[PDB]
């Protein structure tokens, strides 16, 4: 074995993130204006542009969620927050139209009465929210949740890396299997841990277990360019969720912050300490204010729009069916 | 699949840019002095200096077009200002001696009448300009072109990144295949569409396409150093087009700028802000002020004579036939 | 052969660092806070800890080995002193309660001196100490030593990257296995040489000589995070001993030094000039001043815990059995 | 093919440069300080230490090749100045003791003149001093001299970059084989004409055309530090010619430079602007200054001896026959 010992499953695979790969243009009569961006959040809920927001305390609270719904995509509310809150905040989203919502739960103890607070608030989806879904705990809590309330309420389960987590989820009873383990860029899981899965390989690996199934897969984290949602969505996911690039906007919680002349707000894990607030696998920092969130998705979806002109995708089903070219250090 | 999922085709190739390759010194008897530079632009047209400036704003206007011809290269008009005026300089540059000049075109309504406009100008080449060659209404522009004035004026069409898109303007009745999709050093294409392919990959692909139909292929953008040049043709290439490279010479359109005491000018891609005045995929820069073009030709002319020296290549036709070594990162 | 000359084996394999790879998620029913964290230090020696301190004279004197052994992990007191120095601090370590300590001897004349008063001094390990232990004489001392005192004193053997050089120690009589030549964050032998292996390599092809006979791997070198302890032991080896990760804390030896109003301590190899106070392999260096040892070890032990969490690892011996993905420059 | 077109040697080799591999240790009896360094520079001349200067004017005239042979080395005269300058150099360093040195000669007209002149002087080594001996008046120069003076003198050629070149040099009847284009410190050839070859690559195929008929390698460019000259050799070269690592020596041409209060010499190709005083393949630069020679060569060849002790080699011939393990950008 040419990199070492005798067993050739030891690595098992080469990774490869979005920046190991470029789309490859396809031939095309798909105008990016008239091109289709509605894409599969879940089994049944269908969005009209295929991005959703973080479920984290410098992301997404009420005024978050609202603006992506009336943008065509959807905010998933965080849990760092007393369950009475959270829940007002699922109203206030109800409050201001028929918009969908969505909101985090864990797998504690108090997780199953936060999701029953969250269903008699009206939310549309519950996503379980940890980071290695694979484990009996989080797939029992899948299940449950779909056997009690799965008819009116889709369930969404996180995050896997590999297609073995991604099978257990679907037979728990996933309605959209969501993926990355370690790339969000205030990740420090990597470094802290040195666990976690380059996003390109892992999302070809889900999607190898939940497409055959019907079960749409949510790209989750290391997202940095519109392109990268065009890459994510052609590895074969459905939806891309947002952290990093909607936490600069006047939506997300927090404040301005100035430093040397320029405008910033807060980003951080809710694995950092002062998320938190012990071994932290997030951190705490600042991204550029970008205005109007409308405005950012206007430019995300341009580019996607842009990559379904160049490879001939009419559609975000036919995106899923475009080809990448591997690019080495130079490129 | 060892990058994953069950499908090998989803990551169809490896590309390789400049950067990756270097020329093979090879068997010589030739002198960098003695040897023979010129090439075919297109089917009938035989250039004496393999080389091209690209059709944007910052770089060819009828200066450039007069000082590139002279100088036994090309210059192809910009298409960002009305068709009286690009017709007029096409004028100006036959006003100036039999010299060659190449004039862009679009796809749109009144593309069939700007060409119309050229070829009572004069024109020598129309090329036909877009991000996407392979789309039924730019096939079908090269093709209405050449059953229309084809017997007087040579047809251009690009860009492409692929074989089968090569394959198709072929196919479609070009008499040369432009190469480059996103490799632009002002390109932000691969960041805002996750779009592109390696050149020197791109190009081994056209050529392929393009070669046993006796069609030129021209290598387009990417081309920072005179090596580029060598290593372009090398990969097959006929003739290169420079953008940046030629940017910063006194015959390019625009005033000097002084920044820190040195001097430079703007340069700036025509899918910028700026060249469209939305969605770009180009930015707006400086490049350094190089002097007069036909030093810059001489130097970088140069470069591709040594190139032919060490490779044992006494006409394009042979570097074509030269072989490249992959480096690594370390190289 | 693709990289030159006709004899496949002249680059005999591909070197993987810790950079180069990530652990693997796996089905998982582990809490971090519960993983079991003990493991071999030598076929008798089990540690709470896997974690063992550099034989450095910026890292390890009586101090540093009492904090270790009762943080659960040992440390390796230095030999860059006399005899009869080195043998008082073995003692002051037993005088502090019934504290595991090992202690660097080298093959030299003296040696066999030296090791005779560690003896004698209550010493639990002798770990013979060198940058290259496939050689006649450091295998006669490791043999000799243990014939002589193995019934009462553990002894280590080191350094190795090699499959062969790992088997030969065994076949010794050594008790344990130290890997690294090279690997160090302040070695300079592979500049100064040219010699190295990489350390994730070097451990499986260590372990694949060692695993089979019952003999731990210790993994020496190039541990810049908590993370890089997961990767060492998932690649096979037992333990990991830490140099920089440790010099910084108020344990290692030398005073506080105050750079632009931030604080350091000396961090130098046992090959650099100063320490041999020629032709030095190591150099003279500062690491950020990280307060007690207990806490540091507290961040390290915790991000092993998380990977045990994440890879399914309910002891160190299954976290061995862990699956890696190797990842590209990108990532 | 995966990297483009269908023609699989278009990209004929992947070529490794010093920094893409490490030398292996193995087992070993070999003390650094009985470690034999004597070698081949050509199939008569030995030396005590395998290094010799370039023929360089900011690295070797006259005291440079006397403080060289004195260290056990040998020094090559540079040849940009006029033959009778050239020649009284050489008779200066025979007036110093029965010192080797070796002096370079062109191919041009006055190449001939030159040659014989350096052959009255009492010259050991001439070397025909090319960027390309694949090339039918190098190698009918190297023959006509060797069968010319032959006898008396050992002919050098190159510098060749293929396995070919190199096969090319030997029929022609050279005594020694240099091997180098495009790696040195200031050379831009690989930028200028795209041309290069990586240099482990290049000397594993030289030697692979060299070594059946029993002639030496000289590894000429690309060393950077004393690991780089063991990595030379066990690629399979007997010597190693210097430039960068000499040019700041007491010993070369040119006076002391202060620069931010730190001493430098100028250093620069012979491609360059100012030596050739057109288009340049080389820079002009500048190097620490390092102090004697004498000094610098000790700390060059205790690194040779210390990568000979790590790998087992008694001899030279014994270095050149080590393993690597090929490395990647993390390593
Ligand atoms: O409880 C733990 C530690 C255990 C988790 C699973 C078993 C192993 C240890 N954590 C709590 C939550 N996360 S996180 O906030 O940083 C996180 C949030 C969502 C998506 C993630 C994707 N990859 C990394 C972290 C992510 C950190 C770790
Ligand atoms: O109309 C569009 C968008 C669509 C284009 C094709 C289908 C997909 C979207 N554009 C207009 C022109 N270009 S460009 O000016 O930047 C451009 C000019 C020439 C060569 C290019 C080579 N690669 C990239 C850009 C290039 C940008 C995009
Ligand atoms: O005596 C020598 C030189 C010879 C050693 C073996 C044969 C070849 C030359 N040295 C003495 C000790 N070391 S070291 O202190 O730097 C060292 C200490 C422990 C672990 C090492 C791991 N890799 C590198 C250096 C290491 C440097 C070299
Ligand atoms: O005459 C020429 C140009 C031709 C040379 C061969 C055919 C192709 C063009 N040159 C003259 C000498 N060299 S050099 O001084 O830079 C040079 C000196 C020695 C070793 C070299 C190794 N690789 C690169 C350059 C080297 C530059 C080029
Ligand atoms: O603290 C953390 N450590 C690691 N991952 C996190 C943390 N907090 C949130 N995440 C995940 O990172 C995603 C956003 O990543 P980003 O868009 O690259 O900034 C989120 O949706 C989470 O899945
Ligand atoms: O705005 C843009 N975005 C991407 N590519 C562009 C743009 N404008 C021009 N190009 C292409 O980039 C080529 C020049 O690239 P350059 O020589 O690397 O600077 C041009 O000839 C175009 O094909
Ligand atoms: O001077 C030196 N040169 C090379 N390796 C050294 C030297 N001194 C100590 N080492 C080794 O480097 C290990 C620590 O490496 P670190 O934890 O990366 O700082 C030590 O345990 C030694 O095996
Ligand atoms: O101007 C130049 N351009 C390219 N190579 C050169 C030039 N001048 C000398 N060389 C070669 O570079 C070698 C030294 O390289 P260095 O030791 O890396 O600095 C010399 O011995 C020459 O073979």
Redesign the interface.
């Known amino acids: 074995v040419?990199?070492?010992?005798?067993d050739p499953?030891?690595?098992?695979?080469?990774?490869?993130?979005?920046?190991?790969?470029?789309?490859?243009?396809?031939?095309?009569?798909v105008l990016?204006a008239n091109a289709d961006t509605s894409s599969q959040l879940t089994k049944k809920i269908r969005l009209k542009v295929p991005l959703v927001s973080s479920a984290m305390d410098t992301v997404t609270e009420a005024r978050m969620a609202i603006a992506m719904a009336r943008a065509g995509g959807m905010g998933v509310l965080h849990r760092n927050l007393p369950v009475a809150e959270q829940a007002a905040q699922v109203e206030t989203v109800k409050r201001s139209g028929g918009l969908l919502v969505g909101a985090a739960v864990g797998v504690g103890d108090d997780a199953w009465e936060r999701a029953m607070a969250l269903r008699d608030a009206g939310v549309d989806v519950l996503v379980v929210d940890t980071?290695?879904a694979?484990?009996?705990k989080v797939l029992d809590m899948v299940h449950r949740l779909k056997t009690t309330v799965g008819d009116e309420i889709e369930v969404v389960g996180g995050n896997?890396?590999?297609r073995?987590?991604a099978a257990?989820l679907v037979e728990a009873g996933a309605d959209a299997v969501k993926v990355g383990?370690?790339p969000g860029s205030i990740c420090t899981?990597?470094?802290?841990?040195?666990?976690?899965?380059?996003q390109?390989?892992?999302?070809?690996?889900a999607?190898?277990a939940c497409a055959p199934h019907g079960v749409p897969v949510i790209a989750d984290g290391g997202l940095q360019?519109?392109?990268?949602?065009?890459?994510a969505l052609?590895?074969?996911a459905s939806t891309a969720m947002l952290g990093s690039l909607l936490a600069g906007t006047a939506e997300s919680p927090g404040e301005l912050i100035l430093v040397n002349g320029k405008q910033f707000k807060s980003y951080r894990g809710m694995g950092s300490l002062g998320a938190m607030q012990?071994?932290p696998?997030g951190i705490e920092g600042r991204v550029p204010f970008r205005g109007p969130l409308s405005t950012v998705i206007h430019?995300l979806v341009?580019?996607?729009?842009?990559?379904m002109?160049?490879?001939?995708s009419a559609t975000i089903e036919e995106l899923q069916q475009a080809?990448?070219?591997?690019?080495?250090?130079?490129?």
Chains 1, 2, 3, 4 share one sequence.
């Open positions: 040419p990199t070492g010992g005798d499953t030891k690595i098992a695979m080469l990774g490869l993130t979005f920046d190991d790969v470029l789309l490859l243009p396809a031939a095309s009569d990016p980071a290695h694979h484990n009996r896997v890396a590999t073995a987590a257990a383990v370690g899981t990597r470094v802290v841990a040195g666990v976690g899965a380059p390109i390989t892992a999302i070809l690996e999607v190898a360019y519109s392109g990268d949602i065009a890459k052609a590895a074969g012990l071994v696998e430019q341009g580019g996607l729009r842009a990559a002109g160049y490879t001939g080809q990448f070219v591997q690019i080495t250090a130079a490129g």
